[PDB]
Symmetry: C3
Subunit: 114 residues, 3 copies
């Protein structure tokens, strides 16, 4: 799995330990070993949400399975929770796109997961 | 709906009001209220299009519906038009990937749109 | 086709000539290089398996030319380039492949449909 957050929150407002926290919480949530979890935070972005430049985030979570109705609500509560606590972003200013990838469409270590 | 543009155009060449113009024009084009629209511009990128580093843009539009043949042609004319006028990017050096997201696969405000 | 690589490798470690990717993608996909778009994003705040050693998160979008065997080939190619040029271990690279419908790719005021 792999989680990306793009935000207008400045770099200095991202707490040390954030990428580790996301890695551990995502490992717990998805039931996958942390060794497979990739996380990426992109601060200082030029963005707007509803026409406002108040803190916001545009995120993605890609997984091979483990994507679906109830699971995605649970991930949203988790990830919005983290972004609110750690980056002070309102949950109503967060979008998270969820992608259920086919194993043949994820490359890794010179091959794919197929 | 949500629109992202990555470009090699420098930040100083992004005019004031650009995010807001995107927001307003996307609201007009998609019909959706502006308060839902997210926009994101990433200048100063290291990119090439057809092997050349002349101004170019790689973009995405995600929407829950309101994606299809004619709609996407209309969006492309709109967006290419804005990029040409405001960032001086030739339309033939713009790619826009369109994504029709399932509501269950879009997180927002501690829950999804399903 | 379009290829995007996001990496914590610093900008100074991306060698001259790298945006090589265009040529090699043209060759791999059997498409003219005029169609190929490439984007490299260095200096990123990222981890892979909880480590901040060099890593990359990438995407390849194509209108067709995506599938089992093809994607393995693309991955050997691309991981090879990332290892040689950016000193990223192949097991610290993910590449998401997307088979786009022509109607869902915009270009030159219209789409490819
Ligand atoms: C996680 O293992 C994963 C899933 C999809 C893309 C990348 C990583
Ligand atoms: C807009 O409401 C929207 C649609 C799809 C993904 C993100 C935002
Ligand atoms: C290649 O021509 C291509 C570029 C953008 C999206 C899909 C394919």
């Amino acid at each position: 799995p792999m989680f990306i957050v793009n935000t207008n929150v400045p770099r200095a407002s991202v707490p040390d330990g954030f990428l580790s926290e996301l890695t551990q919480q995502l490992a717990q949530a998805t039931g996958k070993p942390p060794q497979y979890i990739a996380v990426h935070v992109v601060p200082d972005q030029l963005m707007a949400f509803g026409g406002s430049s108040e803190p916001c985030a545009l995120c993605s979570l890609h997984s091979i399975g483990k994507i679906g109705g109830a699971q995605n609500r649970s991930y949203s509560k988790l990830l919005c929770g983290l972004l609110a606590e750690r980056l002070r972003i309102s949950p109503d200013r967060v979008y998270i796109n969820y992608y259920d990838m086919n194993a043949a469409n994820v490359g890794w270590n010179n091959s794919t997961f197929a």
